[PDB]
Design a protein around this ligand. Sequence first.
Ligand SMILES: CCN(CC)c1ccc2c(c1)[B-](F)(F)[N+]1=C(C)N(C)C(=O)C1=C2
Ligand SMILES: CCN(CC)c1ccc2c(c1)[B-](F)(F)[N+]1=C(C)N(C)C(=O)C1=C2
Lengths: 159, 159
Amino acid sequence: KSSSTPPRGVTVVNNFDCKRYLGTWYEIARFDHRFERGLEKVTATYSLRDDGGLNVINKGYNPDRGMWQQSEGKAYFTGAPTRAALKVSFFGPFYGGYNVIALDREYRHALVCGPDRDYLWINSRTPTISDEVKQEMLAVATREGFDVSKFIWVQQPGS
Amino acid sequence: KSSSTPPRGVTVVNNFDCKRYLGTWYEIARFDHRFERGLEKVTATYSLRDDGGLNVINKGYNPDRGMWQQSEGKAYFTGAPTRAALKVSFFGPFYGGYNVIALDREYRHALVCGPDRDYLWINSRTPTISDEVKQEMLAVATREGFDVSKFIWVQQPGS
Ligand SMILES: CCN(CC)c1ccc2c(c1)[B-](F)(F)[N+]1=C(C)N(C)C(=O)C1=C2
Ligand SMILES: CCN(CC)c1ccc2c(c1)[B-](F)(F)[N+]1=C(C)N(C)C(=O)C1=C2
């Protein structure tokens, strides 16, 4: 399907406050994909741009090579900035939808999907999350049609 | 073969001046790979790290999506810093050898290869090169066993 639209049916957050989502997030779990392959301790960082999009810097550690790496990209809303439907673009052939489909009131925990059900992330402001938050994230993922067998639990400080 | 050694039988520069190689280079031609697919107007910018490695910033334009992108990586010598054999690594699964196989004395044109003969670049301090310089670089590539018909000639200022 189009790499520009959300997966059909997902619950895009429609009262989004972009300022509250800025800064750094820890990747608690991801569906594994080429872009991120081999990485642990992954974080994503968002900053505002003058042009109304977001600067994205993802960082992680590759324990096979013993080195940190970083990737810088840009995200732009696909519609109104109060709707958490975006597209993100990195160097090369890494481009597609970015959608926040679950978020707590305090912007502490997020479930983010790509443009299809092969792309999903559990993110947190903290490097670890409680089992209850894990359970709820998997429950939401399942209810929205995603195959939670695809998740890998990303090593983080204290995991 | 090993991703960490030069291609079999390929001679690498053995009296390398790393500091003179720093700065911005324009990519005149490349063998096509996923990492850079879709990108025109490509430059690579090298700088020194406190740890003896190089920071690498690749930047290019994707005319399909209408956007500039950049990738930041690290390169380390695999041996003596006088020998232009390195390995470069970027976010995720882009890791492998980087070898300077020909350089002019002025450090204005360089032929760079990866760890096998499927990876080759013609780089220049200027965005275009003379037919003279072009043919010589192709003759070196050819001398070293590469198939120059695999080059994509990359759109650049004045090209
Ligand atoms: C499908 C298009 N695409 C490029 C692979 C993406 C889409 C969506 C995303 C990412 C990439 B990403 F790898 F930058 N990513 C990370 C690291 N985290 C923590 C995210 O929540 C997220 C979403
Ligand atoms: C095969 C290992 N690997 C990562 C794909 C590379 C090896 C070698 C190189 C690059 C990548 B590269 F894509 F960063 N690259 C660029 C953009 N230019 C202009 C080069 O001279 C060069 C060499």
